[PDB]
């Protein structure tokens, strides 16, 4: 197994995580709306429930513009059965849920008014939108944001108010014996250029995404499998190597980057009650 799939489990990253947890009063656990139970860190939830029960855990479901609204509301219901949750679209220009999140942090500040200030630390997987949420709450691009994972490598304080501080954290991946490299890559842990043999994960993308969405997005139809789909896309887009050979690897990398960056619409449906 490649070390690129072992990325996100480093001792430095988890020392950063526990530093943010020890410094923070309110833990904003950021979830991806396309996979909320997939991006949920029950490892950190167990640690917070066992060792530091005084800290308040709040779910923030980001990227709700990539999922249908009814599915997003169902996910909010499922998560609000457990913890106080908010809906969020982390954009500097056009945010959603920013006022509700500000009001929730104001309530927690009213609870901890005896202390001089409170610290709110943001945790979650890579590329869920932690730094983007910080930027949306601040109103200014104060944290570096990029669609590739692992831009935030250290912890950073950003003052939202004179009594509220915001802490950014590097993206963490809890270790699990049931997690696969395909699941990690589809959740967005890894970078697509560094992984080997990219086209093995294309059938997983074709399973998670409806066929008509692929046909509308890439303006191609009639493929019988992922290999023929990548070959047709390569011949259409001109991704040809020396000797007229299609660049299936580069086309698969393009499709994977589109899938994690949300140019291809997909979501996980909520469980039925």
């Amino acid at each position: 197994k490649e070390a690129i799939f072992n990325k996100g489990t480093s001792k430095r990253i988890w020392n950063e995580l526990y530093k943010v947890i020890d410094s923070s009063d309110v833990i904003l656990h950021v979830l991806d709306a396309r996979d909320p139970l997939g991006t949920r860190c029950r490892h950190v939830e167990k640690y917070l429930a066992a060792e530091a029960p005084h800290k308040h855990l709040v779910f923030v479901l980001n990227k709700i513009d990539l999922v249908p609204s009814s599915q997003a509301a169902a996910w909010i219901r499922i998560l609000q059965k457990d913890h106080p949750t908010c809906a969020m679209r982390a954009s500097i220009t056009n945010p959603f849920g920013r006022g509700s999140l500000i009001d929730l942090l104001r309530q927690f500040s009213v609870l901890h008014k005896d202390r001089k200030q409170i610290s709110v630390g943001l945790i979650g997987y890579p590329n869920v939108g932690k730094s983007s949420i910080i930027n949306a709450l601040r109103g200014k691009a104060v944290a570096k944001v990029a669609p590739i994972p692992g831009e935030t490598k250290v912890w950073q304080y950003v003052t939202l108010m004179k009594r509220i501080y915001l802490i950014d954290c590097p993206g963490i991946v809890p270790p699990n014996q049931h997690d696969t490299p395909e699941d990690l890559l589809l959740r967005g842990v890894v970078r697509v250029e560094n992984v080997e043999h990219p086209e093995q994960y294309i059938p997983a993308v074709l399973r998670k995404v409806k066929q008509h969405h692929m046909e509308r997005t890439y303006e191609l139809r009639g493929w019988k499998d992922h290999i023929e789909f990548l070959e047709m896309l390569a011949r259409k887009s001109g991704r040809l190597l020396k000797g007229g050979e299609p660049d299936v690897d580069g086309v698969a990398k393009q499709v994977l980057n589109d899938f994690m960056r949300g140019k291809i619409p997909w979501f996980t449906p909520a469980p039925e009650p």
Binding site: Y18, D22, S23, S24, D25, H54, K55, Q117, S119, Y157, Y165
Partner: protein, 233 residues
């Protein structure tokens, strides 16, 4: 092969023709071999051999004493209900070694220039940070109490019951070296701590459960990796 096959081979064929004689000769040379090992082994092997032979000699002479005597208390008389029983309200360790402020705190240098700023002090001894503790923001924390040096329980022993229970710590009452060390909650030798004594079944004269009691640290946690305490009963 299956089952006791070497024993069956010894039954059906025996052993080597010199086996008993060589065993007897080796047992006879054992004394010379032991003396040669005692006079010619060197280093850690020699030290371990000498300690092990000392243990064997002690066990052997105890065996001789027992076989020789196979065929054979307080000063003042007290009744059976007063046996095993024992003003100045002194603690078990009334005086310890004082700790200087370099031995307590080291200087954490911060900045980016060649000349750093050294206002941050890190506590080197173990501490009890208290209940519901959240670390101060980094721009305002002076006294760093690291996570790996935080202790929440202590091995507290009852002087009368002669049993040791692992009890939670409630607060640090007095660190004898400095009141600042008490305020920081530093666990050193001779420090009075408050422990939860709910597991010892201590009760008052009417039935109220006593769940807080003073104990004193009797070890060096920074050298031993554990907090050991004696109840002040």
């Amino acid at each position: 092969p299956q089952n006791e096959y070497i024993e069956r081979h010894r039954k059906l064929h025996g052993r080597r023709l010199d086996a008993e004689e060589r065993a007897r000769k080796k047992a006879a040379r054992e004394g010379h071999k032991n003396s040669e090992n005692a006079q010619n082994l060197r280093g850690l092997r020699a030290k371990l051999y000498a300690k092990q032979r000392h243990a064997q000699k002690i066990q052997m002479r105890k065996a001789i004493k027992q076989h020789e005597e196979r065929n054979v208390e307080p000063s003042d008389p007290i009744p059976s209900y007063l046996l095993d029983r024992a003003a100045r309200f002194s603690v078990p360790i009334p005086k310890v070694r004082g700790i200087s402020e370099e031995e307590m705190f080291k200087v954490v240098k911060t900045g980016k220039k060649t000349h750093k700023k050294g206002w941050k002090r890190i506590v080197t001894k173990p501490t009890f940070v208290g209940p519901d503790f959240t670390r101060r923001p980094v721009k305002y924390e002076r006294f760093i109490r690291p996570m790996g040096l935080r202790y929440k329980k202590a091995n507290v022993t009852h002087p009368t019951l002669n049993v040791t229970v692992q009890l939670p710590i409630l607060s640090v009452k007095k660190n004898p070296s400095n009141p600042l060390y008490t305020q920081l909650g530093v666990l050193t030798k001779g420090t009075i701590i408050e422990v939860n004594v709910s597991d010892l079944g201590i009760v008052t004269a009417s039935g109220k459960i006593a769940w807080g009691r003073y104990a004193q640290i009797t070890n060096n946690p920074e050298n031993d990796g554990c907090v050991n305490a004696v109840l002040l009963v």
